[PDB]
Chain A
Amino acid sequence: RQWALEDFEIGRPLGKGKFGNVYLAREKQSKFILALKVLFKAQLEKAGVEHQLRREVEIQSHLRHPNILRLYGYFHDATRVYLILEYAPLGTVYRELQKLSKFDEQRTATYITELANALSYCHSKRVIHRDIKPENLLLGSAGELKIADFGWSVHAPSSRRTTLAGTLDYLPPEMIEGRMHDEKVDLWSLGVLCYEFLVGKPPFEANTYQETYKRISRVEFTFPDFVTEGARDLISRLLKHNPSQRPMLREVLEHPWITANSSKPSN
């Protein structure tokens, strides 16, 4: 495997992941700054995710889009896998949401546009995402959103029992009801994110798993009074129980609330 650790200067940790740390790094010949994600093979294997991650990394290697974190390459030694990643200097959308409590309409519409552009590019390659959480979205130097979790699939359409345990909050009804799912799951994800960005919490949040499950299955959510008519409309269209009733990504990108408030355009 041609890249090797000595190709890079290593700096401070950017964060600690489940299977290892992510470091600030610099390729020595170009001085290009990037991120080096370290994963311990034994840790992946014991978690039973080692096969799945190799599938996801292969998929990720084809995805070149301004709002998808770039995978530059990878290499390994006897105990560790190293992923060479685009460096996202402004951290996670999760942290930004913690800092600001909630996002204004222009920031929100702009993120949704960037997500829709990314997902539109993916769908054109017959690639679908799993659940999209704020913690898995990173921010680039100009504050541009990057889908960063390699959470790609693989099979469409599909009926295959998801880890439902974990966090239900971001899963669409058809996945928690054990029904068939396809690329329409990504539109549900956009609705949950649009809501969480504006409100500060996801719309089906409850105190127990069983309660959250019912909220999602029955699509029981309400809006704070400050959420405007245009946002309510878009979110309500995305959070349809019936996946086929959800809009196309192009329709999201063309929604009056998005076009009035987004500082970014389509493609």
Chain B
Amino acid sequence: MARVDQTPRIATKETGESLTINCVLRDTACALDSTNWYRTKLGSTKEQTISIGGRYSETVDEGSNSASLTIRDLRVEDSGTYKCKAIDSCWLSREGAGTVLTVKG
């Protein structure tokens, strides 16, 4: 039953807009206190880390066992699949099912 709900599952945005991704670790006492964010750009096969800073910001809410990623001033290059991936406080592997983002524009 323990699981990560990542929302939204699908996002279509226009250039210059914003996207917020939420990941919530549910049905476990394990804490989601340190998530890393990853992206595989559309067309590519290469999974990259998302660097925090600039257009990319993140928050973590201890009380709700969640973390979020916000990307500002969206570009067409940003199109791709995003995931939260983490090792929770129980040292167990956790990952969201992903957000498929398409930017047009």
Contacts and interface: CB of A to CB of B under 8 A. Distances in A.
Nearest to B48: A126
Query: What band does the interface of chain B fall in when counting residues whose beta carbon is under 8 Å from A?
Result: 20 to 34
Interface stretch (A153-161, A203-211, A223-231, A244-252): A153-161
Contact of B49 (A51, A54, A81, A127): A127
Given A51-B34, A58-B87, A76-B91, A155 B46 contact: no
Interface in B79-104: 85-87, 89-93
B40 to A, nearest CB: 11
A158 B47 CA distance: 22
B47 A157 contact: no
Given A54-B91, A58-B86, A74-B91, A155 B34 contact: no
Contacts of B87: 54-55, 57-58
**Interface size, A (range):** 20 to 34
Contacts of A124: 46, 48
B49 A125 contact: yes
B29 interface: no
B12 interface: no
Nearest to A55: B34
Contact of A59 (B33, B36, B93): B36
Given A57-B87, A58-B36, 10 more contacts: A51-B34, A54-B89, A59-B36, A76-B90, A81-B91, A126-B51, A154-B52, A155-B53, A156-B51, A157-B54
B47 A1 contact: no
Nearest to A73: B93
Contacts of B90: 76
A163 B51 CA distance: 21
A28 interface: no
Interface in A62-82: 62, 74-76, 81
B49 A59 contact: yes
A113 B69 CA distance: 36
Contacts, number: 50
B19 interface: no
5 smallest beta-carbon distances between A and B, as pairs: A156-B51, A126-B49, A54-B87, A76-B91, A126-B48
Given A1-B92, A55-B34, A62 B47 contact: yes
B11 interface: no
Contacts of A157: 53-54
Nearest to B85: A58
Nearest to A81: B91
B85 A126 contact: no
A109 B54 CA distance: 36
A158 B50 contact: no
8 contacts: A1-B93, A54-B34, A54-B87, A55-B34, A62-B47, A74-B91, A76-B91, A155-B52
A127 B37 CA distance: 12
Contact of B51 (A74, A75, A155): A155
Given A51-B34, A54-B34, A58-B86, A126 B50 contact: yes
A55 B50 CA distance: 13
A124 B45 CA distance: 12
A61 B89 CA distance: 17
